[PDB]
């Protein structure tokens, strides 16, 4: 009925950039927390 | 060889994260129907 490669295209193209953005945000927050001397470094 | 004085840091606040997530999800929603044909 439909094209099979579309499953892979949609799922990979949704999952990869989302994780890239979450990575960027989390590393920013970790750097900010590390800069201020606190209980979590 | 040595410590490069040209390195810097990268930032991303929560508002930009939300904008990026919304853009990706909406774009996928729009194009999925045409990809499946």
């Amino acid at each position: 009925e439909v094209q099979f490669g579309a499953y892979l295209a949609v799922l990979l193209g949704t999952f990869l950039p989302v994780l890239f953005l979450i990575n960027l945000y989390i590393q920013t927050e970790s750097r900010k927390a590390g800069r201020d001397g606190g209980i979590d470094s | 060889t040595g410590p490069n004085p040209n390195k810097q840091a990268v930032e991303l606040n929560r508002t930009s994260l939300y904008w990026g997530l919304l853009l990706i999800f909406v774009l996928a929603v729009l194009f999925s129907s045409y990809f499946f044909n």
Binding site: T14 | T15, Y18, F25, S32
Partner: peptide, 28 residues
Amino acid sequence: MEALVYTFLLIGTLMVIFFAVFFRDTPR
């Protein structure tokens, strides 16, 4: 079988909207 993909995408968008509205950085 693609109805699962459509439903997952729509529910994910709604979840993103909910998190953006209720878990937000304070304007201060």
